[PDB]
Symmetry: C6
Subunit: 66 residues, 6 copies
């Protein structure tokens, strides 16, 4: 698996992401936390994002992957 | 596994937080969380409606407020 | 634990429902029956609606669950 | 559990009920249910097309079909 | 059970029958079925693309095919 | 059966690819890695693409899978 290492690096390094949903709209924030099903995305508020509605997670800058 | 969904929904429902629920097609639902189970969220306003979790993209509190407190009880 | 009693009360009490599909369409009618995967919605005909394509089930009047 | 879908679809198949099948993409298919299985419906018109249940939002028979 | 997809796809592959594959968002792909497994269809023309079955709404033969 | 070998050719041979998503967005890059659930796609950044949202994977040039010899 690669999802957890990928998301943990973005969180633990406070990397801003752009989260594109299956409907095409884009969320922006920092990955506060995540489990098997959801991502907690923070900015003004912290919102709970369902992984089944995420198409792609786009980091603002390259990250040194596992 | 699944750790964050229930406490996040639970505190919104316990403190009666107003929420915006965006569906996977763009429609915005607004109301208060009443109850939820593994597969649906019941949301109150004009009536209480059953929202399928598989149709939800994101649940947005109208005001911040969980995964950060050092204590669970 | 919640969706079966919810859909059971609607059907037994003849509560008209608005069913919103993920394709934007709003279906209207009454809940004739339901199983794990479908809801049969009574109108001029009975149609079979897949739960996977349902976003929300909106009662025409409040449902009271024990 | 899974109790109504197959009896419903089988009446449409056995009795050649004209149906309208509305997809998740909004598209409305019309024709006759030639056959089906756990995952797909075969729909007959000019050709027989294979329709994925996961893409179906609703199956609307053109005539009242009343289950027990 | 799972008993109709593979024979339907297999005869389209065998006979090089062109198909229109409408995706769940309504996009129409066109080509011939190169191969397929439990999860994807390999659709050949310009190049060979891997189409996810979860993203397919319908597979329409360009002409009737004796099932 | 097909999907892992197909993506592997793309990854190992560094084939430029377009990944179309169910929203219609077309992503362009090269496959750095992938598992059962996600594709990591590289260009200016490496982004994590969920397979459940992929509609079609379109290589920039022909890609063939070897027939199994009996």
């Amino acid at each position: 698996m690669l999802q957890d290492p990928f998301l943990n690096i973005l969180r633990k390094e406070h990397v801003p992401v752009s989260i594109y949903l299956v409907n095409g709209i884009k969320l922006q924030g920092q990955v506060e936390s995540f489990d098997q099903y959801v991502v907690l995305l923070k900015n003004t508020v912290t919102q709970m994002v369902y992984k089944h509605a995420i198409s792609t997670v786009v980091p603002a800058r390259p990250v040194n992957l596992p």
